[PDB]
């Protein structure tokens, strides 16, 4: 039993070594996520605790983790075949020992386990009984004593009384902002990384996520670029060659410029690995972008670069 | 000759290294250590190299390096003042951690690795220590607790910034293994440290697909947990799972993952039971990724004779249940393809209009859920959709022939799973289903019980608690109480 | 002879189209595409024509057109700048959607058809794309939702 519930490296090692010195075989540790068990794992459990002669009945009725955590005395007495009351009491003792160990990460929502275990270490054994019924830390302040007798399965009256008196006390006593335009071929990495670096400081940001090879024109992307307060531009090495004297919609980076500039918002260019060309390689509507200046990105003091790019937005008067 | 060479490969590798590992052991030469280091590194890159022989020749060799008393030599040389001996010792230590040596390293070494986690600048250092942390997150829950509580996670989350095409794979597998074998506390402290946000630049890189696969796997395992799914959905990186899975092929990543890690025949059983709990969850991305991985593994493991582990774990019943209620094209396709790779026959999807069923459709339903031995009794009593939706325990016990309480409880569990899926377009009038599902997703299962009695959204404001106990068939008192308190408020207020 | 011709009808139709479907595949000729298009359209109007044989000769032929890698050619030619190649490609695409090819079209093509749904004026375009939408509404619930 010490090996099976081992939450430490030292005593597990010593225990396994001491069992290896005798002829008794070494058990294997069991996964702490008791719901979403299958029949095999239940069988190994019943092989390690000592109820090895009832494995047949469990493999017959196809009991799993869920059906194990909600067993009652009737099913033990009738079809599982535990006639004597002393065997049933041993089984429940082992089971409640196991249910204070399990991991309810996939059923619990409001971390009800912790709020129960705060009252008493022995009070965690009922948490699945509460969760499978549907209660949580917002819905406990209006439950009755009878409603815990058969729905949740708490039998001892003292425990019901303490749960009620400790819960009834507790009522409460204890459109994007900026936009980022970038070349689809190169500059993906610094676009993603600028997105996360801006989002971690409290600014919302919407980035293009694989729209091409579909409906491309007026496809819910043109209001985004006019309803965003600040505009950003990613100057990758060799990122402005495709828009050199084409002035069509095939240049996917052009439209955003022509609309953000019509609105008249802050367009911060990011200078990295490339400087501006001669002003003849761009049309009459694109003579303005050649003249702007922006931040020079570096891969060494990224945090300072973010601390500086915050001010270059409308951050002084955003939102 | 693999069953013969288990003596022969080890009788030609230990002969030379058995002396060379300590040939230069006491020498404090700056440039002297590097030669023996390179020598041993070459040998361990030789063991793995030749295919179909490299598993045992690697594992027994690593065990002999453990038994020879050489781990302490590495743990010494990790603290040396010179830097190039440190990076060569780390790159050699990367290639030795197998399932047995890792226990000894977790016993003794664990502090020096954390001491190395402060040195961030030399790239050959970070490239190997990231793989060291990757292999060390798989050991135990206490080891994960220490590596999250001593600052060993901050290293990973800082190294996520750089642009190395081999560092990021180790970084992604580190976060995935940590979230997979970690536990509850480590997950909460992971999502508190904005780890869901840092996975986004790792999944959006359009340079390689293995990085995207490991990043999506990590975010899906983090999003399976119910406590912090709100944070993860607020991070916005779950939206990038569907396109990726939709734009790939399991058949081509089959014949991959057979050469990269250790040239092995897939992942183990105890590794395979880490995917099935994310295959049964009320999320779509998680299910898709799980389907993908299972399909790939099934491909790799169906060439061999091992076709029983997927029945021992219980993936067949979960995949068939995934096919039967398919509300998507991608996971249905992947599921059918993975079932076709095995001998199990493919089920057919079922019509969502559960009322106005006939006996045939009921039979096929009972053939797909697993209650296949009771089909006779249903065909005898001529049960239909209507008579199915209004079954009680008495008819199960008496004439349908389900004596045991555990079978009846399985049947009701499957049935209530089905009744939240049905289409009540021909019985409901005031769209009562929606008004129920707004309270709780689990509350839709009673809607037919209300409709067949005659209630609607104009007549609920004057019903009692007893009037719901036998007329409408709502047994749990909490559910009755919430329905009454939410309806009695609504006269015309919303 | 229907139980005999399941080898015989397919051994006289694939012989010619098996080359003609790609005979003019890379040619960017304006008037060159139309000839091969008309040729294939004639063949698919031949398979359906002769009674009591047309079911299997149509379905296996359509499956072979799927397996030959020609759907992507149609999905390309649906985006061509010329209009008469578009209408001929649409009228050919109308006659191929059977229960198996429709899955592949719902997998990949679905956006270009919606892009064609904006063009309302040419009547031969609308007459075929209406039948395309007719056949594509029968696939799944998600496809109808989209």
Numbering used by the authors:
A (entry chain A): 376 to 549, 561 to 705
B (entry chain B): 56 to 549
C (entry chain C): 56 to 201
Authors' own words:
SARM1 regulates axonal degeneration through its NAD-metabolizing activity and is a drug target for neurodegenerative disorders. It is self-inhibitory and is activated by nicotinamide mononucleotide (NMN), resulting in depletion of the intracellular NAD-pool. However, recent studies suggest that nicotinamide adenine dinucleotide (NAD) itself is an inhibitor of SARM1 activation and the balance between NMN and NAD controls the activation of SARM1.
For the dHNN-treated SARM1, larger octamer ring corresponding to both the SAM and ARM/TIR domains could be clearly observed. Its 3D-structure was constructed at 2.4 Å resolution with residues from 56 to 549 (ARM and SAM domains) and 561 to 702 (TIR domain) all fitted into the cryo-EM map. Extra electron density was only observed near residue Cys311, the dHNN-target, but not other cysteine residues, consistent with it being derived from dHNN (5F, purple). dHNN interacts with Glu264, Leu268, Arg307, Phe308, and Ala315 (green) in the ARM domain, pushing the insertion loop (red) toward ARM1 and stabilizes the domain. The IC50 of dHNN in the SARM1-dN-expression cells is around 4 μM, close to the IC50 in vitro. dHNN decreased the cellular cADPR in cells expressing SARM1, but not in those expressing SAM-TIR. These results suggest that dHNN is cell-permeant and acts mainly by blocking SARM1 activation but not its enzymatic activities. Chemical blockers may well be an ideal tool for turning off the NAD depletion. dHNN uncovered in this study is the first compound ever described that can block the activation of SARM1, revealing a druggable allosteric site and can thus usher in a new approach for therapeutic drug development.
